Amino acid sequence: GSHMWIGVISLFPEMFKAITEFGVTGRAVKHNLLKVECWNPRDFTFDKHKTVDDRPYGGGPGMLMMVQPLRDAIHTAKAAAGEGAKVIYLSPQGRKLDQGGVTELAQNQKLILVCGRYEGIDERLIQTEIDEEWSIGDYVLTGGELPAMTLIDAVARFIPGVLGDGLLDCPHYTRPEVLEGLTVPPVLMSGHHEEIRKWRLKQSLQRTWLRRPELLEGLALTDEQRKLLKEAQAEHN
């Protein structure tokens, strides 16, 4: 009942149809749990060719986004959002997004996401217009739209109504009972709900330990988790 409004600044607003028209996020939008509203800097140009890029001072190969159309688009989104809208710029130089960061961001009722293109935006716009910079990971992309949609999808899951502990997930199985000689673990067939819970937890702990052992350091395990992990490490050994 705590819907979310997300403003987006992008030279390619139609990309956002990927989240607004399909799947769980598509349903969230249709049901007004989530609203995504886009402004395109191109609509804020005044020259005949609607120029949205500009040359960097100091030379170099790439172009930056042109300040005036971009700035005007941001101001327009801010005016539509009213008070309390945090403005976010998606870039590799930003704070690294993780699930904890998602839950933090999901506390905001209003967000404005600025999507960079070309070699990015003028540093002074970050100083004057941007509240926080975030990265979805340590890699470089051709635009901030995919990171913006990634963020929107992640926070959308925390909006009550949208959906139906620091560890990786357990393996899951569905029909058929045998698949290419591979059988479903009997415990999952046993109907014994407490045995199944402990099995999945143990699998989560083992999988986390094997694939992402650094994740376990961030955790204070319950006595039960400590035990199951020890068991798994014993059996693995």
Place this chain on the structure above:
Amino acid sequence: GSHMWIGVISLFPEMFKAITEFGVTGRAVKHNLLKVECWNPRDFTFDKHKTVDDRPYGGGPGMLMMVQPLRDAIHTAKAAAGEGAKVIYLSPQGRKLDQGGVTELAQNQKLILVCGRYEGIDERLIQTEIDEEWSIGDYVLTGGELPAMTLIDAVARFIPGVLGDGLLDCPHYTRPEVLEGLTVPPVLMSGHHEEIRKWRLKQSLQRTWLRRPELLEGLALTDEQRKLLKEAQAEHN
């Protein structure tokens, strides 16, 4: 001249228009540097309602993707790809993507990306059909399509013709010379190309040190980098 073919398995192939129809990646597709071909498990169903999900053994709240339609779609993509196509499943349990991982993946001429929906896919399909699992970051999303497009965008940049050192990027500036009282650093106006190079490098080192100091540990700095970093740390202090 070393184009890339990417097969995609997704219940929502139209999402991929976000990368195939717009921007740099849109141009790569139009110019046949990049080809993205989608198969939808829904087309591989046989029941009247084209069912693509199934119940997990052992109970629990969510659904998994139905094995038969998904498996059949993967086999079809593999047959179209011929030999040498690495099959990748995008999930939070996968290897964490970073720029080094992108460059590795960009070595492949052919990739098949399997996009999970609901609570994911049957573990045995990962054993039998998937070559590698990758994550775009430590957060949970409603589907693997955004991570798939993120990966495609990142590797696309390494395809020769698509575009026009372990450190964060330097600040960049474009017109106007003064923006809300904030001036462009004179060195960038000086025309002195060696001074500008050293300034940007120093800024990259300082920014990396301040925001992502762990990144510097992964590096063996040149004498010049060591010097500039020391200078920056001195001035900051």
